[PDB]
Design a protein around this nucleic acid. Structure first.
Ligand SMILES: [Cl-]
Length: 309
DNA sequence: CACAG
């Protein structure tokens, strides 16, 4: 996942109200722009800080690649000098209550500014250009200054999108793989959604939500332990590579906010706000031993899915 | 160049 800084002093209200970013493809004289070319590098799930009137106003999530699109008519005189031939990105804005003024924090962030194409000068004044790459270390400082609301956009939210993209591509690969028969293809695709033979096989091993004890089939998700995306075709259909979980517990486990020790002890991520467990009446403690086959997968989950600092 | 200053 990549971080971006979009400078929107001229058109913030229009871009926010429309849920987009927009730049020309080229400078007015037809020359290439590093900044406009950055539009073609943004991936769905990338985090974009909106900078306008000296403040960071939004921690946004990109929801498209750049697509060819005309300059928004609603820019009017404020956009007069930009070429009509442009790039648009659908940007899911998340307004923040703590609107940080980066210039007021320049001593803190200066060491983390990139050598080339920095959104800020060393005195903390913004550079006049549209879209800048933000190194991960600079992004972590900005997130520290904004506070919880910035973390809430990223962890188990923005950073899940690239995982979904990867899984979508694998589903396409399976659908086109000549080495596997039609039934296999169907069962592998259905297992991604906790359906088909995977669910029936999991029901031979597990009978209830580990955490909430609910036994009712219509209130339980068939979750993989080792994620579907990184599982081989045998592991994708293995009844021992799963848990039946209530939907909120599936959410916490699938994203790595929680995991389990082999003896069933719940492990809570530093990235899980403990107010969530209080609000949903989920206790820390022991949720029963896992089988040796389940333990192999749960080891993968602890080492690769569980969120650690 | 140039969505900040
Ligand atoms: Cl296009």
């Amino acid at each position: 996942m990549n971080y971006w800084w979009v400078s929107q002093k001229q058109t913030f209200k229009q871009e926010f109200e429309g849920g987009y970013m927009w730049s020309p493809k080229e400078n007015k004289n037809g020359t290439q722009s590093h900044y406009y070319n950055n539009m073609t590098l943004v991936q769905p799930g990338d985090v974009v800080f909106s900078f306008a009137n000296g403040l960071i106003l939004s921690v946004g999530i990109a929801r498209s690649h750049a697509y060819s699109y005309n300059k928004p008519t609603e820019f009017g005189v404020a956009g007069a000098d930009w070429a009509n031939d442009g790039w648009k990105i659908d940007l899911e804005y998340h307004l923040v209550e703590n609107k940080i003024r980066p210039k007021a924090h320049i001593d803190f962030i200066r060491p983390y500014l990139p050598q080339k194409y920095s959104p800020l000068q060393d005195n903390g004044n913004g550079n006049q250009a549209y879209l800048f790459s933000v190194p991960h270390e600079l992004a972590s400082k900005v997130v520290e200054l904004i506070g919880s609301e910035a973390e809430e956009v990223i962890f188990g939210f923005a950073d899940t999108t690239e995982i979904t993209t990867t899984a979508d591509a694998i589903e396409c690969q399976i659908s086109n793989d000549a080495s596997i028969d039609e039934t296999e293809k169907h069962q592998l695709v259905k297992s991604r959604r906790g359906q088909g033979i995977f669910r029936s096989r999991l029901e031979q091993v597990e009978s209830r939500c580990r955490v909430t004890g609910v036994q009712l089939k219509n209130h339980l998700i068939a979750s993989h332990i080792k994620p579907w995306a990184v599982s081989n075709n045998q592991e994708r259909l293995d009844g021992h590579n799963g848990l039946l979980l209530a939907p909120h517990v599936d959410h916490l486990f699938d994203k790595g906010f929680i995991s389990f020790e082999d003896n069933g002890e719940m492990i809570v991520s530093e990235k899980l706000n403990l107010d969530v467990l209080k609000a949903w009446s989920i206790s820390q403690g022991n949720y029963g031993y896992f089988s040796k086959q389940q333990q192999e997968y749960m080891c993968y989950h602890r080492e690769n899915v569980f969120k650690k600092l």
